[PDB]
Design a protein around this nucleic acid. Structure first.
Ligand SMILES: [Ca+2]
Ligand code: NA
Ligand code: NA
Length: 320
DNA sequence: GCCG
DNA sequence: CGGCAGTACTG
DNA sequence: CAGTAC
C-alpha cells in the first residue's frame, strides 16, 4: 500500500521473469511483492527489508537501489521480447512455451498470430475473446452468471447446490472469471449431469464457446442475453459431495493461499488437494508422493483448517 | 527469486 | 542443495 | 508425455 513505489518496479521484473519461462524466480518476486504490499511501513533500511519473510539479501539490495537512485537498472535491461511475450501469453490456452515459439517464429502482434500462427482450439477461442478475457466483470454481472447456471442445473434437480467461488466468493468488487461449483448432497445425483446441463445452456444461447469439457471440470465462454454484454470466462466444476469442502476451498482461492495451505499440509505429513485432505501421505526426499494416505473427513471448510492446526479464515481473508 |  | 501445490485436462 | 490452466 504505502510501498507502491517499490512494488511497481519489482512487479515489472516479476512479469518479465514469468513470461520468459523462469517460473521459480518469478515466484520469489511474487511473494516479495505480496510481502511488501502487506508490510506496515515504507521500507527505509536494508536491515528492515531483510527481516521481512519473503525478502532475502538480493531482494533487499533491489529495494535499496529503488530508494537511493529512484530506478532499477535491470528495468533498463529487460529484453525487448517481454512486451510481445505478454501479449501472446494473455491468449487463453497460450503460455510461456507457446509465446516464446511465436516470438521465435518472428511474430510480434496478435495480427501475426491471427494470420500466420498455428493455434489450438483453445488458443483460437481465447484470441477471439482477447479483449473480453482481459476485463474483470462487476460482481453484479457474476451473480447473473451464477444464477443462469444454477437455474439450468436446478431445473433437472432442485436439490442441487451451486456456489460461485474464486474472487467472487472472496468478496471482491470485480471478478476475473466465474467459478461455478456444482454438487448434490446425496453423493450420486451429480452423475452424468454435464451433458444435460451444458446442452440446456446452449439451447438458450448462453454458452458461446467451449474450452475444456472434462469429466469433473468444464471451462468455457458465456455471454448474458441482451446488449452491452461482454464474453466472460465461465467454469463449472461438478464434484461428489464427499469432496465438496476441499473443492470449495481450493476454487475460492486465492492461488497463493492454496499454495501456502498445501505447503503447510505437507509439513504436517498431510496432503491437501481439491479432492481431499489426506493424512499420513508418504513421501521420499524429493517431496514426492509414494503413499496415498487416508482421506480425512472434511465436511466444512473449517474442518480443513482445524485438521491443519489453523484458525478458520473467511473467504475475504484468503488473499494471502 | 525465497526458504529450510 | 533443491523444493517451491496438486490436479484436471488436452492434444 | 509437455504444456496450460484450474
Ligand atoms: Ca477469480
Ligand atoms: Na529472512
Ligand atoms: Na493466458
Amino acid at each position: 500500500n504505502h510501498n507502491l513505489h517499490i512494488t511497481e518496479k519489482l512487479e515489472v521484473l516479476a512479469k518479465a521473469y514469468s513470461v520468459q519461462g523462469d517460473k521459480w524466480r518469478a515466484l520469489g518476486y511474487a511473494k516479495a511483492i505480496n510481502a511488501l504490499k502487506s508490510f506496515h511501513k515504507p521500507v527505509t533500511s536494508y536491515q528492515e527489508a531483510c527481516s521481512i519473510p519473503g525478502i532475502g539479501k538480493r531482494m533487499a539490495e533491489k529495494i535499496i537501489e529503488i530508494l537511493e537512485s529512484g530506478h532499477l537498472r535491470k528495468l533498463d535491461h529487460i529484453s525487448e521480447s517481454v512486451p510481445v511475450l505478454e501479449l501472446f501469453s494473455n491468449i487463453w490456452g497460450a503460455g510461456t512455451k507457446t509465446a516464446q515459439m511465436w516470438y521465435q517464429q518472428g511474430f510480434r502482434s496478435l495480427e501475426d498470430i491471427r494470420s500466420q500462427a498455428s493455434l489450438t482450439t483453445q488458443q483460437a477461442i481465447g484470441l477471439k475473446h482477447y479483449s473480453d478475457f482481459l476485463e474483470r466483470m462487476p460482481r453484479e454481472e457474476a451473480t447473473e452468471i451464477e444464477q443462469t447456471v444454477q437455474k439450468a442445473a436446478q431445473a433437472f434437480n432442485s436439490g442441487l447446490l451451486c456456489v460461485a467461488c474464486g474472487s467472487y466468493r472472496r468478496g471482491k468488487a470485480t471478478c476475473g472469471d466465474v467459478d461455478v461449483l456444482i454438487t448434490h448432497p446425496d453423493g450420486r445425483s451429480h452423475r452424468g449431469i454435464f451433458s444435460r446441463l451444458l446442452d440446456s445452456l446452449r439451447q438458450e444461447g448462453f454458452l458461446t464457446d467451449d474450452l475444456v469439457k472434462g469429466e469433473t471440470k468444464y471451462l468455457g465462454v458465456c455471454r448474458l442475453p441482451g446488449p452491452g454484454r461482454r464474453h466472460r470466462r465461465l467454469d463449472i466444476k461438478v464434484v461428489p459431495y464427499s469432496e465438496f469442502a476441499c473443492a470449495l476451498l481450493y476454487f475460492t482461492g486465492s492461488a497463493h493461499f492454496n499454495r501456502s495451505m498445501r505447503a503447510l499440509a505437507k509439513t504436517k505429513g498431510m496432503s491437501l488437494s481439491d479432492h481431499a485432505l489426506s493424512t499420513a501421505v508418504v513421501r521420499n526426499t524429493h517431496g514426492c508422493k509414494v503413499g496415498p494416505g487416508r482421506v480425512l473427513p472434511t465436511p466444512t471448510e473449517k474442518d480443513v483448517f482445524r485438521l491443519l492446526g489453523l484458525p478458520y479464515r473467511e473467504p475475504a481473508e484468503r488473499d494471502w
